[PDB]
Structure formats: C-alpha cells, structure tokens
C-alpha cells in the first residue's frame, strides 16, 4: 500500500498551485472573449499529416429542470429517441451519443418488439453510443460518492442487461464544476476516458495556453498514478454549437442549421446559417476549417472533437435532416479538396478517444498529469456558482437520509433470498432509482423549478417508504425463530423511528410508545461493520420507564421532557409524552433487541434530567418528576460523562471547549450572520452567490435559552430569528442541530460561523463527495463567493497544535474567510433569477433540521502530511463523528402487542473490522430462482491521521455455502480476479474495491 501522507505525488498541474500562480485577469480576448486570437501554421497539416475531425451529434436531456422528468419525457425526449432510432436506422453514416439512461430505459420499455430490435441493431453497429451510461449526469459538488456509484450502477446494469454494452467513455457537459471523485469511481468501473466542460474561464485559458486541456487526472494522494483517467476538458464557454466548432461563436453559429427559418431559432451575433450549396461550399468550408484548425491548436494530436448539439436537440425529423445534409455537403467538399488536408466525418465519443490514443501510441503526443478539482466554477466575470452548494437545503438533507435508508434496506434484505410475493426487488429498484434521479445536476443542486423540486421530494418520500417496508420485513425475519416465522409480506411488523428526519420541529410524526400493554420490544440496526454503542431515544406515554435487553439485564436510561419552540421564540413542554434515552450496543452489520417496561414510580435504573429556562412564566410537564427551574440569562457550563466541558454565552451559543479536566478552556464561538443581494449589478439566484459585502450579525434580541442537564445527555437550545440552535452533549464531540426557518426574509442568506484562535492563516480543508479532504487556500485576489466551496460532509482548520472539524449531515456551501474561522450557509432566499435559464429565484424555502458534529482536537502528536501535500485526513474521532451523522443506528418499534419467537441479537458472530474500513454496499444481485445466488459488496478504506493509541473482514464468507469469490468493477458488472481460497483481501488506505460472493 502506497503511503498517502509523507510522499507528495509529482504532477505537471496541481490545481491548488495553479490557483496560487494564476492572476484570474478577466481580459477581453476578442471573438474568443475569455481567450486570445488563436494562430496556426497552415504548413502544420499536409497530405502525410492531416487533421482528422469527428463531429459528434448530441442532445442534452435534463431529467428535470424547467419541467419534471415525466413532462420532458412525454413532450421532448420520447421524440428525440424515436427520431434517433428512425434517422440512424435510415442513415448508416450518421452517429449520436446518449448520456441519461433514466430517459433511455423509460423509452425502451415503452417500445414494441420491432423497434426494440431496431434499437439493439443501431447500438450493436456503434451508430448510437452511450456515454457514461449513468441513470443521470450527476452533480459533482453536493453528491455523495456512494450515490454517484449508485446512479452509475443503475444505468450501466440496465445497459448491460438490455443493450449488452458497458460504456468506457464518460461525458459530463453540464455539472457546475467538476470533482476528481468522478475519475476515481469511473477508473474503478472500467472507464478509459472522460470529458468535462464547466471549468473556470481563467482555468480554460491557462490550460489552453499550455495545451494541458487533455490530461491524465489522478487523485491528489496517488504517488504511483494507477488512479489516472485520461480527461478531455472542452476549451470554450458552452457545449452549444456556437462554442464547439472553434473560438469564434459568430462563425460557429452559422453551422447550427436549426437556427435558420422554419425552426424559429436565430444567431445572437446577427449572421444566420445558410444552406450549403455548390455556390457557397468553398467559402463556407474555408470559414469552418479555419475554426477547426484554431480549436486544434489547443490540443496535442491531429484528432479533433467537434460536439454538435444543445439542450433537447434532435427532437424533429427536419432537424436531423438539416444538420445531417448540410454537414454531409461540407464533409464531401472538405474531404475532396487536398488543400485543406482534413478528413472530417460524423463520429462518436469513444471513436474520438480511440483515435487520440492511436496518435499517442504512434508517438505524436505525451499527455500531462493533473491532480486537484475544478471548484468553484465561474462562467463570466465574478459570477461564481457557489449558490447551489446551499440552494434548497431541505432536499440536500433528504438526499443523505435516503442514502442511508437505501444502504440499510439493501443490506438488511441481502441476508436472505426473498419470494417474489414479498416485492423486495421491486421496492429496492424503486428506491435506488428515485435516489439516483435526485443526483441529477438540477436535483440535489436545488436549481430546478418549484414544481420539479416537489416531484423530486415526492419520489424520495416514496423511496423512503419503500426502504422502511423492506427494512421492517427483514428485521422480523432476522430476529424471529424459524419455527414461528410465518410472514404476511403486506404487514408492518415494525415501524421505523427516526429522531433526525424530518425532525420533530419540522414534522411532528414520531410514534409515542403507549405503555399501561406494559412492555414494548425495540430493535436497533448497525449498518457499519464494527461493534457500535450509541445513545438512542424513543417517545413514551409515561416518564416511569426502564430498559432491559431480552435476557432481562437492566440498562441505564435517562428521561427528558419533549420540547417544541413557538413564535418571542419560547419552548413549551409536553404533559403527555417523554424521551427515554439509553445506550444500545449493536453487532457489526447486526441487530440488538431492547425492552421498554412501565412502572408505578421512578425505576431503579432510569434518571430524570433537570430543565432550566433562562429569560419568566411557568411550564408544567405532567407526570415528569422534576420541576422546571427559571433564572435570568447567564453564562453556563456543562460536562456529560468524561467528555469535553462546554461553556455557552448568555445567548446560549458556544464560547469555549475544555477537552480534559487539566486542559485550557479553548475559545470556540458560534455566531449567525446574514448576506444580502446587490442593489446594482448581478443578483444572487439558485446558482450564483453574489453577496453585497461581508455578512452582518443577526440581531438575537434577548433570546430564551433552555438548558436540559442529564447524566447521559444534556443540551442548550436557543430560539433565534430563523434558527432554533441546539448543542447536544452525550460525552464526546457535541452535536449541533439548527431548525432553520428563513420564513419570508427575501434576498437573505443565513450563515453559521465558528470563531477560534487556531492560527490557520489562509489554509482550510473541505471534502469532495464524502470521499476525500482537499486543501483550500483563501485568495484575497478573488471575490468572497470564489472562496466558497462545497461542504458535502466536512470541513476543518488546523495550526501546529489544534484542529477544529465541522462534520455535516447535509451538503451546504462553506469557507474559512479569515484565520481561525469556519462558516457554512444554512439556507438562502432570493427574489431574483440569476439568468442561467431557471427563470425564477428561490422563494420555496421550508423548515429544515440541519445536523453537525463539532470536533476540537490536539494534533501536535499526529503525523500530518507534508505542507506541500494537497490532501488532509480526518482523525478517528472526526471520522466516527461523520459516520454517526450519515449512518446512525436504525430504530424499529414492534407494532403488535406480542412478539412470539423474538430473538435478542443478529450478527454477534460478524467480524468487527478496523475503524477505517466500511462495507459501503451490500446488495444481493440474484432473485430467488437463481440456482447460484450472488451477493455484491463495496469495501471502502479511508485514511485516518495516526496520533498514537479488530478481526479481519472477509465479505465472501459473511454468507454460508460460498462457491466463488470474484473482485469486480465497482458496478459488479465485470469480473477482475477469481480470488484464492474465496477470501476477499482487505484494501489499501483511500482504496475502494468490489467483491461478488457466489453460493450453492
Ligand atoms: O441542466 C439544465 C441547465 N443547463 C444550463 C445551466 C444550468 C443548468 O441548470
Ligand atoms: Zn443539464
């Protein structure tokens, strides 16, 4: 295993370094506004050395944006694919590439048999070529790597099953900036090439100048380079025809033949396209070939990629005709005229990449190496696209909930074969597909029209219900004696209980366990492959409850009141229901059963939290044994167990953390601020963050502070404008919860900021797709919005001695705008459109419960990478805190009065793997009729910082009667290695591997 800490990789282009050097000057470069006047030597190409040009027709199909998936399917995409089937069938030299398998599967299953066979034949002969073959073209900023893999697997599994093809070339023309997580997953899924478009105009210019727009993209930690994936960056402003023929859109627009008469479209540069004739073909070819030869100067081979398409193009029969016939006339003239020294034809993306690598192996070119990312994107001037890192934060949070629910449903149901009557495979397919669809670059991004967001939400709501049904049927089968297990596959044996989605302040939909019915069975699931202990809570009808395991051993517990906030923002207690809080111990990938039992009076093993209200009136709590205390606002300090001591201001916001008894009170201040929108010039919208100066403090007033002090759990909640802010303490890193209701504060963005004396300077770390931490440098030469980066799961600052890490349960935008600071946007409400085509601002805000862990640590005794290393790594504590947010224990309440044949535990004999190893995916790949059953596992090993302080996991033996163990691509679709003694080796730090076990 490569060291990923001490050795820095050697790359030609390191994007953090490039950022340090680049001036980012927004110079007017002429007809190529963000470039220069390209020159070429006409003697460069001759009859020996010709320019080979591939014109690659395409149609950008958004699975939701202005319309819903179904609306676009019915009114646009259905007609595009029908016309493609017909026109490619009838025109054997014509070509077309297709990216979104969500739409293609929708279309193919509607076809009659005749058309299905016609479709298979134009795919088999390479006319219609799938590019990437994901369910969608995902967002790369907010998307979790697990969901990027999920949506890739959904699409390619469909393509393999139905078209017998697996794409090896990726096409990503629309995501708003690009992540190295994509080459990471693609290269481990059999890919050989990828293409990207939306990078910063200054980066296009800088790389174009060095012919570095094609590069071997490797991970920031990868010394050896085996992660490398060949990447083509397109050089110009857009993927549309005006910005794909060459540097001058006024010329290129004349070669988009849909922009003439009968179609009702036009060229903004005022020169229309003309039909190619014998009279004008020499003149028109002169202009077009000159554009091609200019574009070719930016690349290292004599093979040129010319995309030909735009948003939902190739819809009409007549569009196919006018583009095809005019280009054929141009090709026929250009190829016949030796003076051009060009061979031009319709081609596909893999045809382009194959020809580029042939040129490379002929000795024509050697490609530069590159590491880093392409955030934050700007398309023009100061228009940085950091807005969508936060836009529609409710659905951003919902994404991470559904991610966990799909993993837990696939894992819990994987243990057994199910009868088709159970509809397990149907429910899991539905859940995978709705979560996969939401990875779209107008889904999780929050860049779709209000009604489309509603469609996404309802699809994810149904996916969540499907996951619950699979999980509760699985738990019933796993913990019921086989002698009794007699399933009704339509019955609810358990109801799920989820404290954090949507949150009791958002949807007051937790079931109260009603005891009098004296006892109630609850079950916890642990999707992680190590033993876990975690506090769990349930709502109960009475404060007089005690906890046992199934063997009747008592379990220490705490009872707190149920609290809700009301607009003055004041708490009110429940007289009716109470929280029972206790520590569940759950095996790796297993289940643990506990029992809640009522009694006459205070039980022996259950304690009662005190409650202090700081502002008064009086708050009855019914049967709750301890009266609520009142006091004037004052500073307060709390410690739970052996854990940190936290001090809070009189506004109830953190001000210091003391790690240990004999350690300093380290300053750590939470503050809420607000950004506005410009009165003059460009307005913030769903995409763009265009602040009118630094954030100004929120006016807190004199707020009400509720302090709940318990043996197992304490918390400080405060009712601020737009935010009920809560700090919860269970004995380790505190948990922060913000109930964010931006209400009708138009043109406002609410930020949460941490202020410390950590001497971070201009350095900070943010993650990419929950997979890796990348070093960021704040640049005062760039505007504030350019220093905003995606925070998909975490961010940290460190000096030589001290680190602060903020872990998130949701992707939000964030930065460190000054030494010692972290900040992260909570929500944003924008009255205006930002002119990228969405045609609305963001005024559909709803209450969302944002969750975090705050980890203050000493790192002076940690082995940290070189100061030249472009990566950072979490500690054990920060990693486990992330895992607690993204993959908590699942909680199940037995629905019925009696559970005959209940068992106490499943998975007690499961191996407890090292803390840096995860079973990201467990998925049964076969239905019950397969005589050979197959189960797929994805194994991810992270890299933790070593600071001073388990059984081997062989996934192929987790199930019995194992006949074969194969290492596969991450999609499970290609066998890479038949494994020795059917033992799945453990993987290197920052490596992800997939394995399929086969069983008798
Ligand atoms: O995905 C549809 C849109 N294409 C142009 C710009 C941004 C995207 O939302
Ligand atoms: Zn798009």
From Swiss-Prot:
Details of cofactor binding: Binds 1 zinc ion per subunit.
Chain sites annotated for binding Zn(2+): 60, 62, 174, 441
Its membrane topology: Single-pass type II membrane protein
Named cofactor requirement(s): Zn(2+)
EC numbers, comma separated: 3.2.1.114
Similarity comment text for this entry: Belongs to the glycosyl hydrolase 38 family.
Subunit (UniProt): Homodimer; disulfide-linked.
The protein's name in its UniProt record: Alpha-mannosidase 2
Native organism: Drosophila melanogaster
Gene that this sequence comes from: alpha-Man-IIa
């Amino acid at each position: 295993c490569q060291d990923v800490v001490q050795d820095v990789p050697n790359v030609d282009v390191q994007m953090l370094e490039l950022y340090d050097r680049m001036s980012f000057k927004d110079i007017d470069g002429g007809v190529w506004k963000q470039g220069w006047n390209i020159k070429y030597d006409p003697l460069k190409y001759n009859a020996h050395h010709k320019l080979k040009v591939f014109v690659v027709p395409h149609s950008h199909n958004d699975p939701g944006w202005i319309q819903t998936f179904e609306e676009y399917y019915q009114h646009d995409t259905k007609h595009i694919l029908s016309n493609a089937l017909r026109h490619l069938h009838d025109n054997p030299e014509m070509k077309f590439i297709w990216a979104e398998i969500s739409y293609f599967a929708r279309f193919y299953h509607d076809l009659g048999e005749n058309k299905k066979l016609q479709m298979k034949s134009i795919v088999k002969n390479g006319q219609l070529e799938f590019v990437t073959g994901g369910w969608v073209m995902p967002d790369e900023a907010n998307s979790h790597w697990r969901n990027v893999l999920l949506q890739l697997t959904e699409g390619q599994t469909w393509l393999k099953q139905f078209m017998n093809v697996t794409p090896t070339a990726s096409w990503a023309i629309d995501p708003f900036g690009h992540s190295p997580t994509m080459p990471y997953i693609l290269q481990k899924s059999g890919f050989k090439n990828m293409l990207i478009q939306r990078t910063h105009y200054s980066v296009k210019k800088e790389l174009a100048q060095q012919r570095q727009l094609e590069f071997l993209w490797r991970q920031i930690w990868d010394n050896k380079g085996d992660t490398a994936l060949f990447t083509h960056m397109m050089p110009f402003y857009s993927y549309d025809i005006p910005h794909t023929c060459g540097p001058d859109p006024k010329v290129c627009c004349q070669f988009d033949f849909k922009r003439m008469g009968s179609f009702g479209l036009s060229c903004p540069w005022k020169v229309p396209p003309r039909t190619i004739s014998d009279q004008n073909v020499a003149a028109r070819s002169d202009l077009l070939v000159d554009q091609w030869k200019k574009k070719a100067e930016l690349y290292r081979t004599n093979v040129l990629l010319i995309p030909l398409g735009d948003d939902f193009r190739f819809k009409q029969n007549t569009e196919w005709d006018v583009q095809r016939v005019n280009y054929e006339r141009l090709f026929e003239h250009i190829n016949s005229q030796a003076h051009f020294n060009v061979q031009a034809q319709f081609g596909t993306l893999q045809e382009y990449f194959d020809a580029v690598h042939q040129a490379e192996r002929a000795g024509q070119a050697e490609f530069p190496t590159l590491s880093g990312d392409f955030f934050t994107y700007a398309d023009r001037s100061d228009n940085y696209w950091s807005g969508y890192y936060t836009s529609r934060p409710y659905h951003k949070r919902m994404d991470r909930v559904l991610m966990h629910y799909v993993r837990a449903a696939e894992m819990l149901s994987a243990w057994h074969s199910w009868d088709g009557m159970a509809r397990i495979e149907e429910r899991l397919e539905q859940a995978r597909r709705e979560l996969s669809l939401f990875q779209h670059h107008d889904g999780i991004t929050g860049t779709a029209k209000t009604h489309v967001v509603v469609d996404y939400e309802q699809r994810m709501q149904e996916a969540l219900k499907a996951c619950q049904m699979v999980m509760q049927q699985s738990v019933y089968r796993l913990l019921t004696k086989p002698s009794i297990y007699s399933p009704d596959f339509s019955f609810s044996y358990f109801t799920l209980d989820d404290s954090r989605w949507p949150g009791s302040g958002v949807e007051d939909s937790r079931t109260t366990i009603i005891l009098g019915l004296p006892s109630k069975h609850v079950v916890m699931h642990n999707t992680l492959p190590h033993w876990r202990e975690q506090l769990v809570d349930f709502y109960v009808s009475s404060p007089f409850v005690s906890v046992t395991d199934l063997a009747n051993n008592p379990v220490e517990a705490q009872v707190s009141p149920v609290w809700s906030w009301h607009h003055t923002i004041h708490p009110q207690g429940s007289t009716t229901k109470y929280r029972i809080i206790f520590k569940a111990r759950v095996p790796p990938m297993g289940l643990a059963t506990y029992v809640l039992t009522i009694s006459d009076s205070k039980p022996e093993h259950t304690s009662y939290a005190s409650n202090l209200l700081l502002r008064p009136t009086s708050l009855p709590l019914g049967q709750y044994p301890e009266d609520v205390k009142f006091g004037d606002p004052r500073e307060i300090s709390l410690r739970v167990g052996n854990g940190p001591t936290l001090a809070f201001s009189e506004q109830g916001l953190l001000k210091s953390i003391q790690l240990t008894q004999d350690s300093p009170h380290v300053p750590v201040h939470f503050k809420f601020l607000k950004y506005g929108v410009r009165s003059h010039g460009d307005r913030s919208g769903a995409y763009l963050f265009l602040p009118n100066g630094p954030a100004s403090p929120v006016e807190l007033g004199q707020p009400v502070v509720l302090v709940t002090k318990g043996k197992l759990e304490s918390s400080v909640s405060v009712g601020l404008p737009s935010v009920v802010h809560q700090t919860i303490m269970r004995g380790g890193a505190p948990e922060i919860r913000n109930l964010v209701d931006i209400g009708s504060l138009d043109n406002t963005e609410i930020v949460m900021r941490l202020e410390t004396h950590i001497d971070s300077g201009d350095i900070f770390y943010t993650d990419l797709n929950g997979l890796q931490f990348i070093k960021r440098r704040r640049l005062d030469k760039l505007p504030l919005q350019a220093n905003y980066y995606p925070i998909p799961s975490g961010m940290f600052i460190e000096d030589a001695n001290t680190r602060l890490t903020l872990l998130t349960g949701q992707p939000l935008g964030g930065s460190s705008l000054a030494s010692g600071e972290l900040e992260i946007m909570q929500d944003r409400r924008l009255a205006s459109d930002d002119e990228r085509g969405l045609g609305q601002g963001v005024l559909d805000n709803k209450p969302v419960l944002h969750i975090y862990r705050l980890v203050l640590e000493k790192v002076n005794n940690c082995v940290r990478p070189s100061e030249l290393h472009p990566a950072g790594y979490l500690t054990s504590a920060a990693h486990k805190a992330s895992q607690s947010l993204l993959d908590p224990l699942d909680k199940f309440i037995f629905a019925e009065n009696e559970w005959i044949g209940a068992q106490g535990q499943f998975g007690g004999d499961h191996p407890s793997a090292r803390e840096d190893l995860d079973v990201s995916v467990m998925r049964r790949l076969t239905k019950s009729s397969a005589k050979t059953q197959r189960v797929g596992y994805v194994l991810h090993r992270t890299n933790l910082m070593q600071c001073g302080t388990t059984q081997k996991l062989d996934v192929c033996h987790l199930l019995p009667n194992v006949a074969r163990c194969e290492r596969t691509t991450l999609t499970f679709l290609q066998n890479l290695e038949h494994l020795d003694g059917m033992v799945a080796p453990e993987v290197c730090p920052m490596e992800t591997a997939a394995y399929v076990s086969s069983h008798s």
